[PDB]
Design an enzyme around this catalytic site. Structure first.
Site, mmCIF file in Angstrom:
data_model
loop_
_atom_site.group_PDB
_atom_site.id
_atom_site.type_symbol
_atom_site.label_atom_id
_atom_site.label_comp_id
_atom_site.label_asym_id
_atom_site.label_seq_id
_atom_site.Cartn_x
_atom_site.Cartn_y
_atom_site.Cartn_z
ATOM 1 N N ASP A 25 0.723 -1.338 -0.056
ATOM 2 C CA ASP A 25 0.056 0.067 0.153
ATOM 3 C C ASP A 25 0.679 1.333 0.102
ATOM 4 O OD1 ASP A 25 -1.984 1.738 0.420
ATOM 5 O OD2 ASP A 25 -2.831 1.090 2.276
ATOM 6 N N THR A 26 1.251 1.765 -1.182
ATOM 7 C CA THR A 26 1.972 2.804 -1.254
ATOM 8 C C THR A 26 1.267 4.360 -0.493
ATOM 9 O OG1 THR A 26 1.164 3.192 -3.581
ATOM 10 C CG2 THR A 26 3.081 2.111 -3.062
ATOM 11 N N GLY A 27 0.044 4.219 -0.803
ATOM 12 C CA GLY A 27 -0.597 5.334 -0.178
ATOM 13 C C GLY A 27 -0.552 5.447 1.412
HETATM 14 O O1 DMP Z 1 -8.308 4.801 4.406
HETATM 15 C C1 DMP Z 1 -7.383 4.338 3.568
HETATM 16 N N1 DMP Z 1 -7.797 3.590 2.448
HETATM 17 C C2 DMP Z 1 -8.987 3.358 2.615
HETATM 18 C C3 DMP Z 1 -9.459 3.689 1.058
HETATM 19 C C4 DMP Z 1 -10.581 2.614 0.532
HETATM 20 C C5 DMP Z 1 -11.082 2.687 -0.810
HETATM 21 C C6 DMP Z 1 -10.586 3.703 -1.783
HETATM 22 C C7 DMP Z 1 -11.246 3.780 -3.174
HETATM 23 O O2 DMP Z 1 -11.566 2.154 -3.525
HETATM 24 C C8 DMP Z 1 -9.453 4.484 -1.280
HETATM 25 C C9 DMP Z 1 -8.982 4.440 0.145
HETATM 26 C C10 DMP Z 1 -6.782 2.570 2.316
HETATM 27 C C11 DMP Z 1 -6.210 1.700 3.284
HETATM 28 C C12 DMP Z 1 -7.119 0.311 3.312
HETATM 29 C C13 DMP Z 1 -6.754 -0.816 2.686
HETATM 30 C C14 DMP Z 1 -7.549 -1.941 2.908
HETATM 31 C C15 DMP Z 1 -8.831 -1.767 3.744
HETATM 32 C C16 DMP Z 1 -9.223 -0.497 4.421
HETATM 33 C C17 DMP Z 1 -8.323 0.621 4.408
HETATM 34 C C18 DMP Z 1 -5.616 3.300 1.224
HETATM 35 O O3 DMP Z 1 -5.261 2.231 0.551
HETATM 36 C C19 DMP Z 1 -4.668 4.018 2.075
HETATM 37 O O4 DMP Z 1 -3.686 4.166 1.301
HETATM 38 C C20 DMP Z 1 -5.143 5.149 2.950
HETATM 39 C C21 DMP Z 1 -5.639 6.212 1.934
HETATM 40 C C22 DMP Z 1 -5.301 7.595 2.724
HETATM 41 C C23 DMP Z 1 -4.042 8.289 2.751
HETATM 42 C C24 DMP Z 1 -4.013 9.397 3.236
HETATM 43 C C25 DMP Z 1 -5.065 10.256 3.933
HETATM 44 C C26 DMP Z 1 -6.338 9.225 3.976
HETATM 45 C C27 DMP Z 1 -6.596 8.210 3.418
HETATM 46 N N2 DMP Z 1 -6.164 4.931 4.054
HETATM 47 C C28 DMP Z 1 -5.880 5.609 5.160
HETATM 48 C C29 DMP Z 1 -4.570 5.153 5.824
HETATM 49 C C30 DMP Z 1 -3.881 6.139 6.209
HETATM 50 C C31 DMP Z 1 -2.587 5.915 7.186
HETATM 51 C C32 DMP Z 1 -2.189 4.596 7.285
HETATM 52 C C33 DMP Z 1 -0.905 4.376 8.227
HETATM 53 O O5 DMP Z 1 -0.099 5.336 8.013
HETATM 54 C C34 DMP Z 1 -3.009 3.606 6.706
HETATM 55 C C35 DMP Z 1 -4.135 3.617 6.036
#
Ligand code: DMP
Lengths: 99, 99
Positions: A25-27
């Site tokens: 998960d790059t994001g």
């Molecule tokens: O909510 C997050 N979704 C949820 C999400 C769901 C659906 C879509 C569109 O289909 C997009 C995003 C993912 C993590 C995740 C994976 C699998 C199941 C549930 C959640 C995402 O893949 C991750 O990149 C970040 C995106 C993000 C980044 C910055 C700010 C807000 C949101 N997140 C949140 C996240 C933030 C910090 C950390 C730890 O530092 C881990 C995850």
């Protein structure tokens, strides 16, 4: 290997003696695992995502073997719907994005 | 290009005449953008994340250009803190990951 993105990029991790699957998960900046037995000390914190914030426990210095490579790092354990491997470990394993 | 993951992998997108930055996000199946004015009409949809779920609206067949690359697809607009490019567009620009 390379991973194309036609499917969810899942990987096998071993942590804490237990085997799990986890999403590359790059994001994500940090690694967040569904609730799991880890031995030790930990400090609570919040992370926000899309949707609001969770309260999570952070454990530093946890050895994960990801695919077959080893890393030590901070993992956060909490109520996530899926285990995610974030960039703090992705950079140890050598993971790159290519287009 | 190749992008290492020491910092957040942001790209400039052009979408609907507006320029924005977004995270290349392998963990996300779809693309979610913060609220912005887009034309066409849309369908109400709800996605789950860490934190919980949000109501977004879906637009399909929108053109987005990410770096020089055009792609057309579904974009969800709504209450994300950060514009996220997910796998539905990442596959079209030929993005892989590699370790
Ligand atoms: O909510 C997050 N979704 C949820 C999400 C769901 C659906 C879509 C569109 O289909 C997009 C995003 C993912 C993590 C995740 C994976 C699998 C199941 C549930 C959640 C995402 O893949 C991750 O990149 C970040 C995106 C993000 C980044 C910055 C700010 C807000 C949101 N997140 C949140 C996240 C933030 C910090 C950390 C730890 O530092 C881990 C995850």
């Amino acid at each position: 290997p390379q991973v194309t993105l036609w499917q969810r990029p899942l990987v096998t991790i071993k942590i804490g003696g237990q085997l799990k699957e986890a999403l590359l998960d790059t994001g994500a900046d940090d690694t967040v695992l569904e609730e799991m037995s880890l031995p030790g000390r930990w400090k609570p914190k919040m992370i926000g995502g899309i949707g609001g914030f969770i309260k999570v426990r952070q454990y530093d210095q946890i050895l994960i073997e990801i695919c077959g490579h080893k890393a030590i790092g901070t993992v956060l354990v909490g109520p996530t719907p899926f285990n995610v491997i974030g960039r703090n470990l992705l950079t140890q394993i050598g993971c790159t994005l290519n287009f």
